Design a protein around this ligand. Structure first.
Ligand SMILES: Nc1ncnc2c1ncn2[C@@H]1O[C@H](CSCC[C@H](N)C(=O)O)[C@@H](O)[C@H]1O
Ligand SMILES: Nc1ncnc2c1ncn2[C@@H]1O[C@H](CSCC[C@H](N)C(=O)O)[C@@H](O)[C@H]1O
Ligand SMILES: [Mg+2]
Ligand SMILES: [Mg+2]
Lengths: 234, 242
């Protein structure tokens, strides 16, 4: 974590974010999500964690659209994955993909105690080959309702070209961190780790592309670090 | 407020935003909102920006989020409480299918008639039943006449800010199980973040205290699941559980 941006907020004060979390998020957070978050807070990459207010937003979307089959790309310790698994019905199904299974094992005991591991097919791999392989075998009747994209930041455009064919018409594709700590707002942004700058430029290009992509409708939402919701049109 | 009482000259929060910079908000609007905004929404927004109550207008990024929720949940029958010039109402009517139906309520029809030419030009006024009235008597009459068959899929609440809690007690019975109730402005320019806050007009302070109480109440209400979203001035989404 030699990164520069980890502690930057997109909201105007730490006090405002704290108010949201303490008033509206933590009281509604499943005990196993609380447990998973607290153990993840001890980890070196805790800054990658999907925050608790964003989690409840993901859950609300899944329930409002009556999602049943989803894909979760970029799992880390499993906060967004457990959010999804708790939101789905008892017979819901999730394909979860991450290059690093050791991160998943940090949160897996909490997923198991929540009683939802049976919904999850965890695949340890880089996401792009898995999505390529899904496209070759995907039957139209098995298209996903919802995809959450939170893996290699520099690769979101490549994920998008597969996902617009893997989610159903009317299904949702959510891209996490599309404001990149607010640093996308300017053509140049000093002081970044070179990997952070790669990600920043990738998101500026992605945001412009998705706003013109005729295959989806979009809504960029200033929650967490920015989330762009895409809905497949055809 | 826009509906009744104090003028805009007294208000203290109008120039605040919940995001960390105006540059970030401008980036969101110019990159992701304006390119996806219907030309009649653009026209309605631009005429409304010149009105004395422009601070109450639902912004363009929030509008596209409302549209996205409506479409993802396949909403068909909705209620819009607090219309003003009609930005969120036109957003809803464009999002709904051709046979969608909206019950729109506002105490001031003259505000609505500012936006009506754009709604007409957009070709979706046929979906809208506009009712000029305070909202509570209308909702109470709906409670007496409603059958389970005709419950609303979605309600957008953006009327008298001091009175959302009373709206909520009706809407949890008027929206179907699994349907959505959205409360607008629940972060009130960030001023909800402290028990005490300096220098607001009495009406702004009454609204601030109302939102602090509402946010605590909704988080404790077993009838709904919630998500408070830091878009616009804060939107709290509620989903009816029973
Ligand atoms: N090419 C790749 N394919 C799949 N996963 C990748 C990847 N590159 C990085 N990742 C994974 O992407 C994750 C980003 S952090 C994901 C956070 C998680 N969604 C949450 O709810 O908190 C890390 O776990 C990392 O191991
Ligand atoms: N008691 C009441 N019943 C119904 N409408 C009310 C009301 N008190 C105030 N209002 C109306 O609530 C509106 C708040 S501003 C609404 C903004 C609008 N939703 C948008 O998309 O921009 C004003 O038009 C005001 O006239
Ligand atoms: Mg992320
Ligand atoms: Mg409002």
């Amino acid at each position: 974590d030699d990164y520069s941006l980890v502690h930057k907020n997109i909201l105007h004060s730490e006090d405002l974010l704290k108010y949201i979390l303490e008033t509206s998020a933590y009281p509604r957070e499943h005990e196993q999500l609380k447990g998973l978050r607290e153990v993840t807070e001890k980890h070196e990459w805790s800054s990658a964690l999907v925050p608790a207010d964003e989690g409840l937003f993901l859950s609300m979307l899944l329930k409002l659209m009556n999602a049943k089959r989803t894909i979760e790309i970029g799992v880390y310790t499993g906060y967004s994955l457990l959010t999804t698994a708790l939101a789905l019905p008892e017979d819901g199904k999730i394909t979860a993909i991450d290059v690093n299974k050791s991160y998943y094992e940090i949160g897996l005991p909490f997923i198991q105690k929540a009683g939802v591991e049976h919904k999850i097919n965890f695949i340890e791999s880089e996401a792009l080959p898995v999505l390529d392989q899904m496209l070759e075998e995907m039957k139209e009747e098995d298209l996903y309702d919802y995809a959450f994209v939170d893996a290699d930041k520099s690769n979101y455009a490549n994920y998008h070209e597969r996902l617009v064919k893997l989610v159903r018409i009317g299904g949702a594709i959510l891209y996490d961190n599309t404001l990149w700590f607010g640093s996308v707002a300017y053509p140049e942004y000093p002081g970044l780790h070179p990997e952070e700058e790669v990600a920043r430029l990738s998101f500026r290009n992605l945001n412009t592309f998705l706003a013109a992509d005729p295959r989806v409708e979009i809504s960029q939402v200033s929650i967490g670090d920015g989330v762009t919701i895409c809905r497949r049109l055809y």
